[PDB]
């Protein structure tokens with residue numbers, strides 16, 4: 001895959017790819033397997049999400065999942081007989097192979113260093129940058145021949161102490177992304193590299209009201225040393241039911257939002273390939289405003305020439321947004337799907 005001069009994703013053939021995507025969680029958690037396999041058959045659940053119109057999937061994972069003898073949990077083996085005995089690595093192998101056989105694009109995502117919380121930086125007190133890079137190379141090495149695997153989202157949701165272009169090696173996400181980029185492309189040179197934003201930054205940023213991995217402002221001062229034809233920018237953005245930012249409370253709302261989205265990520269759409277790695281919310285099951293907010297975001301995305309991204313999420317059991325499926329793991333939120341098809345232009 002690559003990025004052409006029109007900021008479009010093209011495949012090996014040279015045809016434009018459109019990512020009608022959604023996030024599928026589980027592999028980055030204590031269970032070390034995609035969620036819902038207590039309620040559903042994994043193959044049938046994939047079949048369903050393609051049928052709704054999705055052709056792309058973002059797969060969070062964690063280091064533990066990639067280890068040889070890590071066992072999965074919460075799997076109902078009555079509904080999932082062909083996973084019995086398999087290690088979580090072998091289940092990941094089998095899931096990526098299934099997406100591939102169905103012709104569904106897969107963006108792998110290094111979500112958490114410890115199968116729990118999301119780290120501020122690319123390293124912790126028990127997970128070094130060396131381990132981080134090695135794990136990226138491991139994944140790239142393993143799946144580099146799986147045609148429909150798109151590439152790698154280097155690290156999920158940088159925030160807190162993370163900075164960009166300050167000259168401080170311990171916190172500069174931009175430089176860490178360059179090193180992650182180099183590692184992945186050395187092994188899988190046809191993979192795309194997805195890079196997320198940070199939050200508040202001491203330089204080249206108007207701060208405040210920023211979501212994790214949501215600020216790309218410092219890119220204007222400090223370009224990424226990542227090949228133009230591989231770099232995919234993938235910030236996150238959420239609405240009122242994730243956090244009540246002050247601007248949500250504004251009387252102007254939601255007319256005030258486009259300037260804020262423009263500032264945080266939007267202004268880069270015209271010169272960089274860009275999509276949202278995560279966006280979503282309860283869509284009226286949670287608030288009056290989240291309906292309005294999601295509608296406005298789609299309207300703004302369409303206007304910036306953006307008709308792709310990865311909705312958050314497939315799974316219901318995401319605190320604070322819900323998903324495409326309801327809590328019965330079978331019923332589909334039709335209004336959420338109508339919103340996405342609007343975004344996709346379908």
Ligand SMILES: O=P([O-])(O)O
Nearest residue numbers: 001002003190229
């Ligand atoms: O596929 P390339 O020509 O962008 O490297």
Ligand SMILES: O=P([O-])(O)O
Nearest residue numbers: 063066067135138
């Ligand atoms: O198999 P890994 O997680 O040690 O790279």
Ligand SMILES: O=P([O-])(O)O
Nearest residue numbers: 043081082083094
């Ligand atoms: O049912 P399969 O995927 O194990 O052949």
Ligand SMILES: O=P([O-])(O)O
Nearest residue numbers: 114115116117118
């Ligand atoms: O992963 P945490 O829960 O220790 O932050």
Ligand SMILES: O=P([O-])(O)O
Nearest residue numbers: 063131132134135
């Ligand atoms: O298992 P790792 O994270 O040390 O590669």
Ligand SMILES: O=P([O-])(O)O
Nearest residue numbers: 167168169172175
């Ligand atoms: O000092 P650095 O962050 O530019 O390496």
Ligand SMILES: O=P([O-])(O)O
Nearest residue numbers: 219220268271272
């Ligand atoms: O770095 P930009 O300003 O050319 O997008």
